[PDB]
């Protein structure tokens, strides 16, 4: 996927 | 115009800074803050991080040509540090 969202 | 803000964040007890990121050179979308978790370290430092902030530098590193997964690792790496502090230079509209 080119719409990744990651929690930091 | 747009402007740059330097933001310094120390992670919480779980090692989390309290923000989400989207983008990266593999995502064909600039690296950008997509969430600020209310009352997290990223929300309570001064100056604070804002949703929509464009990430320019991570601990001095220009990340314009790095992948999503790379920059997540760079952020996690700042916890294993001198001051445990993450320094984000961001661009704000
Ligand atoms: Br502020």
Contact A4 B75 (CB under 8 A): no
Separation CA B49–CA B47 (nearest Å):
7
With CB atoms and an 8 Å threshold, state whether A5 touches B20.
Answer: yes
Look at residue B10 and give its three-state secondary structure: coil
C-alpha distances (whole Å) from B84 to each of B35, B52, B56 are 21, 24, 20
Q: Where are the beta strands (DSSP E) in B1-93?
A: 3-9, 19-24, 29-36, 54-58, 61-62, 86-92
Experimental method: X-ray
Q: How much distance in Å is there from the Cα of B49 to the middle of ligand 1? A: 7
Q: Dihedral sign, CA of B61, B62, B66, B69?
A: positive
Could you give the number of structural domains in chain B?
A: 1
The angstrom resolution of this structure is 1.9
CB-based contact B75:B55 (threshold 8 Å): no
| CA–CA distances in Å: residue B91 to residues B52, B54, B57, B74, B83 | 9, 5, 10, 18, 24
Q: Rounded to the nearest 5 degrees, what angle is found at the Cα of B83, between the Cα atoms of B68 and B91?
A: 45
> What range does the domain containing B12 cover?
1-93
In 3-state terms, chain A is what percent helix, strand and coil (to 5)?
Answer: 0, 40, 60
């Amino acid at each position: 996927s080119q719409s990744r969202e990651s929690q930091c | 115009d747009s402007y740059l803000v330097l933001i310094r964040i120390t992670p919480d007890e779980d090692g989390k800074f309290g923000f989400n990121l989207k983008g990266g050179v593999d995502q064909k979308m600039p690296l950008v803050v997509s969430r600020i978790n209310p009352e997290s370290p990223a929300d309570t430092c001064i100056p604070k991080l804002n949703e929509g902030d464009q990430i320019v530098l991570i601990n001095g590193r220009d990340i314009s040509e790095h992948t999503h997964d790379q920059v997540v690792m760079f952020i996690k790496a700042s916890r294993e540090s001198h001051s445990r502090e993450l320094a984000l230079v961001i661009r704000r509209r």
